[PDB]
């Protein structure tokens, strides 16, 4: 019956400004605490922070590394949760969550904040911090037995990457795209060689990306 | 980190793993464990002394005693294969809230398998272009959790270091992709740049110079 639905996430310059809104149903949202928590791609999850309700004067916790540059806010007449993303930072892209908090205490054995558990979450929205503006990317070839294209410096996702047009499927595996500091994504994709024959076959991987409208093909020799 | 777990737990099938979490606000305070599968929302499993909400198996089940915190799967099934957090208070009274490291939980399905590291040197068509880029391509590993440090001579490198998530390959196996982002100048200076990888307590290097 509860359902937590996240939005407003995109792509954000460094410095820029964002806000993120999270819409509640199926409980009581005016006396209900919550909290965002957010997640960098590839890590783990992290508190951001977290707004009480109105027996407790609307008071909001933030994290060290959030205090100053974001700001939670409620409204408890359109069930919605605000998280606005200022002085952005390229270490602040992961996606964000919103969470209906539970507040526990035990009576017998128990501490003077009380334990904070999170009950219900939603689903997620993505915020990407980038600076840069659209790119084509630039591969260079990886000489060997494993055969391989470096993808680097390629803005926005996604590029394809095919081998001999084709005809090379055995034992491809390309790679997951990894964000930089530079804002910039760059990807590799390997093959595995048959490591007797290689004067005899070319090696030729065809990259391919549609937001620069951009092929580039590069024979991979060996040293 | 004020809450510390292990990096990643194998369990049998229909076996039973206890993963732990540790911090010094552990003492004073409880414990709430959430389970978090790729792209699916995290579910909490267990929080409190003995509470266990209505939905999640009676298999899971938590426990407590001094500065730890343990979360235990009795009969581990293939579902329950995903990432576990600890959340609690990240100071002895405090206000705000703290997750922990993460354990990468893997069910036995594969026979485990030790990876195999390649290193790429930049080639010369990259320092042309005063770029140098070293790709530690790995593949062929079971279970999917390693860790990858890279060395400059005999010295860590921590500037520059992009390395993805372990993504299962056409054979089953886990496969992994470290990247490091070096000048020119950096690059024909060092006499050696190695790429350690870490995989179930072992480490396989791969060396590459000028």
């Known amino acids: 019956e509860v359902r937590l639905v996240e939005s407003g996430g995109g792509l954000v310059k460094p410095g820029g400004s964002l806000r993120l809104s999270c819409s509640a149903s199926?409980?009581?949202?005016?006396?209900?605490?919550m909290t965002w928590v957010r997640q960098p791609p590839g890590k783990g999850l992290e508190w951001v922070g977290r707004?009480?309700?109105?027996?407790?004067?609307?008071?909001?916790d933030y994290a060290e590394s959030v205090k100053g540059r974001f700001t939670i806010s409620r409204d408890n007449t359109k069930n919605t949760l605000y998280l606005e993303m200022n002085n952005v930072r390229t270490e602040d892209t992961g996606y964000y969550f919103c969470?209906?908090?539970?507040?526990?205490?035990?009576?017998?054995?128990?501490?003077?904040?009380?334990?904070?558990?999170?009950?219900?979450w939603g689903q997620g929205t993505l915020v990407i911090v980038s600076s840069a503006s659209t790119k084509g990317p630039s591969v260079f070839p990886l000489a060997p037995a494993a055969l391989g294209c470096l993808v680097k410096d390629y803005f926005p996702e996604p590029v394809t990457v095919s081998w001999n047009s084709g005809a090379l499927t055995s034992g491809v595996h390309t790679f997951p795209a990894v964000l930089q500091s530079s804002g910039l994504y760059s990807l590799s994709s390997v093959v595995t060689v048959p490591s007797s024959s290689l004067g005899t076959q070319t090696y030729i991987c065809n990259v391919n990306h549609k937001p620069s409208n951009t092929k580039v093909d590069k024979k991979v020799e060996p040293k | 980190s004020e809450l510390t777990q292990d990096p990643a737990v194998s369990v049998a099938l229909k076996q039973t793993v206890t993963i732990t979490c540790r911090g010094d606000?552990?003492?004073?305070?409880?414990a709430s464990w959430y389970q978090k599968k790729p792209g699916q929302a995290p579910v909490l499993l267990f929080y409190?002394?003995?509470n266990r909400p209505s939905g999640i198996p009676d298999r899971f089940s938590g426990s407590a005693s001094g500065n730890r915190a343990s979360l235990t799967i009795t009969g581990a099934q293939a579902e329950d294969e995903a990432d576990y957090y600890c959340?609690?208070?990240?100071?002895?009274?405090?206000?705000?809230?703290?997750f922990g490291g993460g354990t990468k939980l893997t069910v036995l399905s594969q026979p485990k398998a030790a990876p195999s590291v390649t290193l790429f040197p930049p080639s010369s068509e990259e320092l042309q272009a005063n770029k140098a880029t070293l790709v530690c391509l790995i593949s062929d590993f079971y279970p999917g959790a390693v860790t990858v440090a890279w060395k400059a001579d005999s010295s860590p490198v921590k500037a520059g270091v992009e390395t993805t998530t372990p993504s299962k390959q056409s054979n089953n196996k886990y496969a992994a992709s470290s990247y490091l982002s070096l000048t020119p100048e950096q690059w024909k200076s060092h006499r050696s740049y190695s790429c350690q990888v870490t995989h179930e307590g072992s480490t396989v290097e791969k060396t590459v110079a000028p």
């Open positions: 969470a209906r908090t539970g507040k526990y205490y035990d009576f017998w054995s128990g501490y003077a904040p009380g334990e904070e558990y999170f009950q219900d």
């Open positions: 199926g409980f009581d949202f005016d006396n209900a605490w």
């Open positions: 959340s609690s208070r990240d100071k002895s009274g405090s206000r705000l809230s703290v």
């Open positions: 409190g002394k003995n």
């Open positions: 707004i009480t309700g109105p027996g407790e004067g609307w008071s909001v």
């Open positions: 606000s552990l003492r004073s305070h409880y």
